[PDB]
Design a protein around this motif. Sequence first.
Motif, mmCIF file in Angstrom:
data_model
loop_
_atom_site.group_PDB
_atom_site.id
_atom_site.type_symbol
_atom_site.label_atom_id
_atom_site.label_comp_id
_atom_site.label_asym_id
_atom_site.label_seq_id
_atom_site.Cartn_x
_atom_site.Cartn_y
_atom_site.Cartn_z
ATOM 1 N N UNK A 104 47.312 4.280 0.139
ATOM 2 C CA UNK A 104 48.626 3.985 0.716
ATOM 3 C C UNK A 104 49.524 3.609 -0.414
ATOM 4 N N UNK A 105 50.591 4.341 -0.682
ATOM 5 C CA UNK A 105 51.539 4.123 -1.774
ATOM 6 C C UNK A 105 52.185 2.798 -1.513
ATOM 7 N N UNK A 106 52.714 2.106 -2.484
ATOM 8 C CA UNK A 106 53.210 0.734 -2.314
ATOM 9 C C UNK A 106 53.929 0.329 -3.641
ATOM 10 N N UNK A 107 54.657 -0.790 -3.709
ATOM 11 C CA UNK A 107 55.393 -1.065 -4.943
ATOM 12 C C UNK A 107 54.441 -1.608 -6.010
ATOM 13 N N UNK A 108 54.642 -1.453 -7.317
ATOM 14 C CA UNK A 108 53.806 -2.173 -8.270
ATOM 15 C C UNK A 108 53.893 -3.708 -8.164
ATOM 16 N N UNK A 109 52.699 -4.217 -8.269
ATOM 17 C CA UNK A 109 52.477 -5.630 -8.243
ATOM 18 C C UNK A 109 51.534 -5.743 -9.428
ATOM 19 N N UNK A 110 51.872 -6.627 -10.386
ATOM 20 C CA UNK A 110 51.038 -6.891 -11.544
ATOM 21 C C UNK A 110 50.110 -8.058 -11.177
ATOM 22 N N UNK A 111 48.802 -7.924 -11.499
ATOM 23 C CA UNK A 111 47.731 -8.807 -11.059
ATOM 24 C C UNK A 111 47.857 -10.203 -11.635
ATOM 25 N N UNK A 112 47.202 -11.163 -11.037
ATOM 26 C CA UNK A 112 47.157 -12.497 -11.560
ATOM 27 C C UNK A 112 45.757 -12.699 -12.128
ATOM 28 N N UNK A 113 45.634 -12.923 -13.425
ATOM 29 C CA UNK A 113 44.359 -13.056 -14.093
ATOM 30 C C UNK A 113 43.880 -14.513 -14.001
ATOM 31 N N UNK A 114 42.599 -14.760 -13.677
ATOM 32 C CA UNK A 114 42.007 -16.063 -13.505
ATOM 33 C C UNK A 114 40.700 -15.907 -14.223
ATOM 34 N N UNK A 115 40.228 -16.878 -14.985
ATOM 35 C CA UNK A 115 39.020 -16.683 -15.796
ATOM 36 C C UNK A 115 38.160 -17.874 -15.470
ATOM 37 N N UNK A 116 36.845 -17.672 -15.564
ATOM 38 C CA UNK A 116 35.850 -18.651 -15.170
ATOM 39 C C UNK A 116 34.791 -18.699 -16.265
ATOM 40 N N UNK A 117 34.628 -19.821 -16.956
ATOM 41 C CA UNK A 117 33.458 -20.127 -17.768
ATOM 42 C C UNK A 117 32.091 -20.050 -17.040
ATOM 43 N N UNK A 118 30.937 -20.037 -17.773
ATOM 44 C CA UNK A 118 29.625 -20.397 -17.298
ATOM 45 C C UNK A 118 29.552 -21.769 -16.687
ATOM 46 N N UNK A 119 28.827 -21.910 -15.603
ATOM 47 C CA UNK A 119 28.592 -23.240 -15.078
ATOM 48 C C UNK A 119 27.416 -23.736 -15.912
ATOM 49 N N UNK A 120 27.362 -25.036 -16.100
ATOM 50 C CA UNK A 120 26.283 -25.612 -16.877
ATOM 51 C C UNK A 120 24.959 -25.439 -16.116
ATOM 52 N N UNK A 121 25.037 -25.364 -14.758
ATOM 53 C CA UNK A 121 23.908 -25.032 -13.855
ATOM 54 C C UNK A 121 23.286 -23.675 -14.170
ATOM 55 N N UNK A 122 24.169 -22.693 -14.368
ATOM 56 C CA UNK A 122 23.685 -21.375 -14.771
ATOM 57 C C UNK A 122 23.100 -21.409 -16.178
ATOM 58 N N UNK A 123 23.735 -22.191 -17.055
ATOM 59 C CA UNK A 123 23.288 -22.231 -18.444
ATOM 60 C C UNK A 123 21.880 -22.797 -18.576
ATOM 61 N N UNK A 124 21.423 -23.741 -17.732
ATOM 62 C CA UNK A 124 20.043 -24.217 -17.801
ATOM 63 C C UNK A 124 19.076 -23.013 -17.756
ATOM 64 N N UNK A 125 19.440 -22.060 -16.912
ATOM 65 C CA UNK A 125 18.661 -20.866 -16.666
ATOM 66 C C UNK A 125 18.686 -19.991 -17.898
ATOM 67 N N UNK A 126 19.442 -20.349 -18.920
ATOM 68 C CA UNK A 126 19.352 -19.652 -20.172
ATOM 69 C C UNK A 126 20.228 -18.422 -20.292
ATOM 70 N N UNK A 127 21.304 -18.325 -19.529
ATOM 71 C CA UNK A 127 22.155 -17.169 -19.611
ATOM 72 C C UNK A 127 23.479 -17.696 -19.090
ATOM 73 N N UNK A 128 24.463 -16.858 -19.412
ATOM 74 C CA UNK A 128 25.877 -17.193 -19.257
ATOM 75 C C UNK A 128 26.670 -16.002 -18.757
ATOM 76 N N UNK A 129 27.356 -16.223 -17.668
ATOM 77 C CA UNK A 129 28.244 -15.192 -17.201
ATOM 78 C C UNK A 129 29.689 -15.673 -17.290
ATOM 79 N N UNK A 130 30.578 -14.872 -17.924
ATOM 80 C CA UNK A 130 32.003 -15.239 -17.924
ATOM 81 C C UNK A 130 32.683 -14.211 -16.986
#
Lengths: 212, 229
Positions: A104-130
């Motif tokens: 469906x065609x529509x007007x341009x809307x430029x996205x809003x960027x939001x970024x998320x660090x690793x949680x320290x909970x995930x980091x115990x598990x030895x890996x990191x997702x950003x």
Amino acid sequence: DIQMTQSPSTLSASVGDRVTITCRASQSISRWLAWYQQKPGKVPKLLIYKASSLESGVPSRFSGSGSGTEFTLTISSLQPDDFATYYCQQYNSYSFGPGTKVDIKRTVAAPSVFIFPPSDEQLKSGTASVVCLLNNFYPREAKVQWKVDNALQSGNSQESVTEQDSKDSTYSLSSTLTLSKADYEKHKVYACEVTHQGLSSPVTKSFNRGEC
Amino acid sequence: EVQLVESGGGLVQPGRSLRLSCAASGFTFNDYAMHWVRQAPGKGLEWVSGISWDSSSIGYADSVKGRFTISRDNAKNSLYLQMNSLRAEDMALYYCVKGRDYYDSGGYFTVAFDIWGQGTMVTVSSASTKGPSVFPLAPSSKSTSGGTAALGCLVKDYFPEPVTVSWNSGALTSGVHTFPAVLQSSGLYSLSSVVTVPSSSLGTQTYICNVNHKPSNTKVDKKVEPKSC
């Protein structure tokens, strides 16, 4: 054996427009071409066959014409329920063409960027997702690049895209960067750089290790 | 009615084999060429096989000769597909389809596939069923950012699909976007559900995400809450 291809790959239109989709088949296929409508999560639905003949109950606004090597499908009035992918199939050897997704065609809307660090909970598990989220935009083409330190430009990510939203008709996107815990804490600035045509410079969202 | 329903789908390791059943009804089975079309997740339609009314002409998608065999049994009124040496490229939804084969000029022609089936999923993997790890993507990015504060839940390292995610025990529905699952580098899946809430309100409200991964009998509710940045 017959190779079949489609133009456009993609199409934006708005309800009312007559659009046309093309299906080219590398060897004469004569009349023996057909067309299917598909919406995600539904079965394929035969709209035209024998290049022109509609099935029973297909609305008269779809049509088809073509002759042996070039075949075309026209909707005269797009109504808000023909935005789907259309495929053509030939019947000398049953290879379907690639598809054409209409949105469906529509007007341009430029996205809003939001970024998320690793949680320290995930980091115990030895890996990191950003995770970087580009939220709500149009058109669908918008790229994301990752940098971890100065500029080590990173090649190891996975983006995923939602379907066109039913009220506003934008799209949103994710890109997860995954590092083990060891290379994660062996770096400091982490950046998500968004480019989209409704932005006049690329946005970088970033963060530094530890001191969040 | 006139129905084509299939069975036989499921998980299977690479290299191994499945036999797929389709049982049709509500038409004189005898007369029609039957066929199977598969569709891979997020890809398009790929025609696999087909067979004449009396089994005298049979064909295979060029990427499948030697491994799949199609066979019909008209008395039972079922089509079957025996699949072998299954690699990862055969992972898809398989459809049972019926040729409007009735045509004749030089030749007697299957002009259209008109009645289709609903599908059976065939999932070739060597992974074991695993429930997710649920991690917060905690609200903020500024504390707020670009307004309405993004916040969410990473649902990581599970097999197989699907896993359901809702926010706030079903009542938080707006702004919620749940992305398509992605299948990772070697294995399991990863998915995020996220929300923008009015920054204003963060500190008042609770945000809980409900993820239920039924193939492992996993129900986790992870209250997301901000860190401070």
